[PDB]
Design a protein around this ligand. Structure first.
Ligand SMILES: NC(=O)C1=CN([C@@H]2O[C@H](COP(=O)(O)OP(=O)(O)OC[C@H]3O[C@@H](n4cnc5c(N)ncnc54)[C@H](OP(=O)(O)O)[C@@H]3O)[C@@H](O)[C@H]2O)C=CC1
Ligand SMILES: NC(=O)C1=CN([C@@H]2O[C@H](COP(=O)(O)OP(=O)(O)OC[C@H]3O[C@@H](n4cnc5c(N)ncnc54)[C@H](OP(=O)(O)O)[C@@H]3O)[C@@H](O)[C@H]2O)C=CC1
Lengths: 246, 246
């Protein structure tokens, strides 16, 4: 008559002061966290973007995770982003933690082919980082002189990005608390290379049908077990989950 | 300082007697329930099947949902299934509910092109139903004489299946409590045609990377809101969710 199953139910209302402890980074070491939203049937997009599906809670969560991060890493696909916005209180919180007032943005591109004309370069407090390959880093540095710091992230193939090198290059610059929000190609590479430490996933209570892509894309296939650290909900039936690599 | 967020936690251990009430069908009317499993990053398969990812709880849940159903509807893709197995106690439970001892199997095929040589026809207590189009129903009836009951499920196009007609044809035969377990093409059609009443989804705590398909496939795009009826968990960090159409 016994089963391994237990009913979950809401046991505690969270104040905005208790949220940071549920999502804090470790005290030490580098930590790469992803934060994505998807539908129940695994779809990442509605009309080409993720925004349509966001829950009453998602803005507390998405804004908190940006506030906690040293750097937000984004793929060049989804940039096409502006400078991350921090409000007054967010800046104060960051300072009290000894971080910069606003997190750095880091754009991953294998080819380095970003035009000087982009909002990631224009509407922003801080020169973004461009993470790219050894093969193209010098040319890219020259082309983006003044607009971005360009960093070579290659492993044994100077024509590709090694995602473990990428994470160590950020940590070498004091950016060890890393957040990524997209896109699916980038996330797929972190998952394929087994460098993703934690996935925060908002499960939106919709089905969207078969057209949408998943939150990850690409040829990778892995089977990486994660531990469920927490599940939050709201009155709208969204689940805000946090899973950390076992 | 207040947020819409609430922490979920386990509040009640479920006995196998309490599970049926969490998953019961309505008293009246037809009800189409889906039961699927997917990874955290929205992948439906590991090495081409769903079985590798199943949780300690999934066998209580998958077996219960089969036990409760009048008919299990499956697409011809994933059949390539045998007769659903019911143990002694499952048969007793069904009888006490006034149902057949074993649920019917119903195979959906647009072309009707199933060979007489299949385990769905061979290793089974009960002739399965074949749900197909008006255009091909008579030929199909003759070819499968003795092995299956063939039912025309077309709407205004005699060359296609109308999924609402499909559900009413089952209900007309006393099979109003319907379960589907696959595959993604079929599920995508139920979602696209807005005839899916409830989705029971097991969220497995793995990431699998970008190669896998979603639990639904096909060109459909919808935005159908569902209410979260419950979330169960186990010690392995699986979530067993039940969402019902709002
Ligand atoms: N559901 C959700 O939460 C989210 C949805 N989205 C969505 O992301 C979509 C667009 O994303 P998409 O362009 O497909 O994916 P990506 O943002 O990840 O970027 C694809 C491009 O980014 C670069 N890139 C990514 N990753 C890597 C790597 N490891 N090494 C080198 N280069 C890399 C490549 O740049 P290059 O070609 O220059 O070499 C590549 O062409 C949008 O539809 C947006 O809505 C995005 C994030 C969150
Ligand atoms: N993660 C999970 O829980 C699950 C995973 N799986 C998987 O399903 C996969 C195979 O499934 P797949 O073949 O792609 O999909 P389907 O089982 O849904 O079937 C595709 C075929 O089934 C028929 N079919 C489906 N739906 C309809 C409809 N509304 N009208 C008419 N005909 C229809 C068609 O038959 P025809 O061509 O003859 O006309 C079609 O070619 C496997 O990989 C299996 O592991 C499946 C279910 C659960």
């Amino acid at each position: 008559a016994d089963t391994p199953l237990r009913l979950l139910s809401s046991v505690h209302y969270l104040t905005d002061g208790e949220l940071p402890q549920l999502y804090d980074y470790p005290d030490d070491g580098t930590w790469l966290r992803a934060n994505f939203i998807s539908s129940l049937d695994g779809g990442a997009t509605v009309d080409g973007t993720s925004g349509a599906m966001a829950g009453p809670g998602d803005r507390f969560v998405f804004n908190l995770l940006r506030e906690l991060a040293d750097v937000i890493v984004v793929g060049v696909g989804t940039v096409r982003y502006s400078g991350v916005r921090m409000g007054v209180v967010q800046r104060q919180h960051r300072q009290a933690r000894g971080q910069s007032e606003v997190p750095q943005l880091a754009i991953v591109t294998r080819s380095g082919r970003l035009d000087r004309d982009m909002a990631v370069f224009t509407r922003t407090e801080m020169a973004p980082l461009v993470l790219t390959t050894t093969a193209v880093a010098d040319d890219t540095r020259q082309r983006l002189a003044g607009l971005a710091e360009v960093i070579a992230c290659s492993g044994d193939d100077p024509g590709t990005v090694d995602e473990a090198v990428l994470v160590s290059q950020l940590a070498a610059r004091g950016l060890r608390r890393i957040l990524t929000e997209g896109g699916p190609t980038l996330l797929g590479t972190f998952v394929e290379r087994d460098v993703l430490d934690e996935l925060c996933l908002t499960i939106a209570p919709y089905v969207v049908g078969g057209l949408a892509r998943r939150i990850v894309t690409g040829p990778g296939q892995v089977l990486t077990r994660m531990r469920c650290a927490h599940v939050l909900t709201d009155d709208s039936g969204y689940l805000y989950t946090r899973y950390v690599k076992t």
